[PDB]
């Protein structure tokens, strides 16, 4: 029934919704179990650091490409540039992604610097050596944090060339909007006589 001045609602409760009500009573319990799972895995794989070294990538879309983040794995080009094989890299804790490609020199250099820097700060115990204890460090990510690069300097000189940035945006829109028609008129004008 429709009554006095109230916003129109859309409460989707016209199925047997009470049969699929999940109440996360176990939030604290699952937290205890997750920390217990982390401690168990830490002991099982000690002295390894509980997570793989991830690369830094750009985020997709125009909404998020201003930021960098952790990616899945280093590309085969990055691993080869860092001086090691993908198969060996996977056994010393480096994530390797065969489907990501390098087209950005800045990101590629950053990941290769990331790989050499990681190599400098790990100890690979020999397969039949003495294997000394090396104070297990739980987080590789906290050891090698992802840094947003520097876009510019804090201050510099005003260079005004009279370009009218707004005019530039307008003209960019117009040239793109009229490229197809102008090429069509160019092609027909060329073909006429």
């Amino acid at each position: 029934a429709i009554s006095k001045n109230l916003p129109i609602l859309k409460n989707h409760f016209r199925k047997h919704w009470q049969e699929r009500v999940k109440v996360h009573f176990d939030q604290a319990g699952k937290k205890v179990s997750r920390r217990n799972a982390r401690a168990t895995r830490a002991a099982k794989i000690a002295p390894r650091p509980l997570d793989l070294l991830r690369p830094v990538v750009r985020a997709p879309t125009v909404k998020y490409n201003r930021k960098v983040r952790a990616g899945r794995g280093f590309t085969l080009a990055e691993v080869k540039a860092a001086g090691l094989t993908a198969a060996y890299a996977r056994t010393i804790g480096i994530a390797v992604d065969h489907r990501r490609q390098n087209r950005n020199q800045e990101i590629f250099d950053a990941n290769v610097q990331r790989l050499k820097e990681y190599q400098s700060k790990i100890i690979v115990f020999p397969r039949n050596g003495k294997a000394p204890e090396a104070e297990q460090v739980l987080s590789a990510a906290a050891t090698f944090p992802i840094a947003q690069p520097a876009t510019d300097v804090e201050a510099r000189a005003v260079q005004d060339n009279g370009e009218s940035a707004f005019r530039t945006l307008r003209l960019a829109r117009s040239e793109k909007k009229f490229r197809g028609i102008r090429e069509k008129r160019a092609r027909e004008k060329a073909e006429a006589e």
Partner: protein, 148 residues
Amino acid sequence: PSRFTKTRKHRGHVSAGKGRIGKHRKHPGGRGMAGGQHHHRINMDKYHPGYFGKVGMRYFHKQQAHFWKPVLNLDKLWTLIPEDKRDQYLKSASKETAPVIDTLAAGYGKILGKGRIPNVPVIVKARFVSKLAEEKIRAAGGVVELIA
């Protein structure tokens, strides 16, 4: 809590505040938005004009991220410089040392022109700007650098 509700006060009174004559029933006018064009027309035309009917174009597979463009006005432009370092630029207002404000890293797509910044030159890096916003920045002695 239950003890502060009118149910407690209605105890002993027969109709529970629902009336003897009207006699609270199940769904006397229909359920949900029933009758919005028939017996709820007046309410719907008075409080929700435009509710029924169609409007312009459809957009199949619309991703909002294509349209991400948070606006920032000039009157808030100087807030992107931290307060500790702000007053140093506000004084000694000159070129050859002008604050670069990267409004994109600040999370903004377009700089609008609500206006009245100080007369200090600033280098505004933005994806988009309104025509008046670029006028006021240039008038102050700054510049807008188009970035992507």
